């Protein structure tokens, strides 16, 4: 770990979590063909957990989740994910350009 920290400079922290999330998603996808419960519950858990992260890795996490899990998830889950992501900006837009 010290040798790893020697390289990659400041961005090692961003790289580590991005690799870990990708590995976890790959494992979940590998367990998919037998356990059909995973695609929904794991996505919900991932959405819940993504709050406790920095924005720098949060953006990459959102991009990876949207690229990977989109084609095999019900539509309403995706729309709920989008609404929950975009509420923080909808509030600002409504306050600054529509509110009274």
């Amino acid at each position: 770990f010290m040798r790893f920290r020697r390289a990659f400079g400041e961005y090692s922290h961003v790289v580590a979590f991005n690799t870990l999330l990708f590995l976890m998603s790959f494992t979940v996808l590998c367990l998919t063909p037998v356990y059909s419960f995973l695609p929904g519950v794991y996505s919900v858990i991932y959405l819940y957990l993504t709050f406790y992260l920095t924005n720098d890795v949060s953006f990459l996490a959102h991009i990876q989740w949207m690229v990977m899990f989109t084609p095999l998830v019900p539509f309403w889950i995706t729309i709920a994910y989008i609404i929950c992501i975009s509420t923080k900006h909808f509030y600002w837009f409504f306050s600054n350009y529509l509110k009274r």
């Binding site: 790959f26 494992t27 590998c30 367990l31 063909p33 037998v34």
Partner: protein
């Protein structure tokens, strides 16, 4: 009709086709799981650490683990082929001696 066993056999065949250095550790895990499932009970007593190890070995999903190895080896082989074609190799220890 049902054909799950044929699918698993095909997966194993494709895995054997894409041979690497790490196939042996997966085969060892599979055979150890089979052996533990077949006898068990007899030589497990006390030693909660041993019981934990036995349970971890038995609960490992071997049947859904080969597929991840397939994708892991695919990128490695693609990279090796790209290096061989574009860049070349200097070490004579490579098994490219066929050509």
């Amino acid at each position: 009709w049902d054909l799950t066993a044929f699918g698993l056999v095909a997966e194993w065949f494709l895995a054997y086709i894409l041979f690497t250095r790490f196939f042996y550790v997966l085969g060892l895990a599979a055979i150890m799981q089979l052996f533990f499932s077949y006898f068990a009970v007899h030589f497990i007593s006390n030693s909660w650490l041993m019981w934990l190890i036995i349970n971890l070995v038995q609960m490992a999903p071997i049947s859904a683990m080969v597929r991840m190895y397939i994708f892991f080896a695919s990128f490695y082989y693609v990279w090796k082929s790209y290096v061989h074609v574009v860049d070349g190799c200097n070490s004579s220890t490579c098994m490219m001696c066929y050509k």
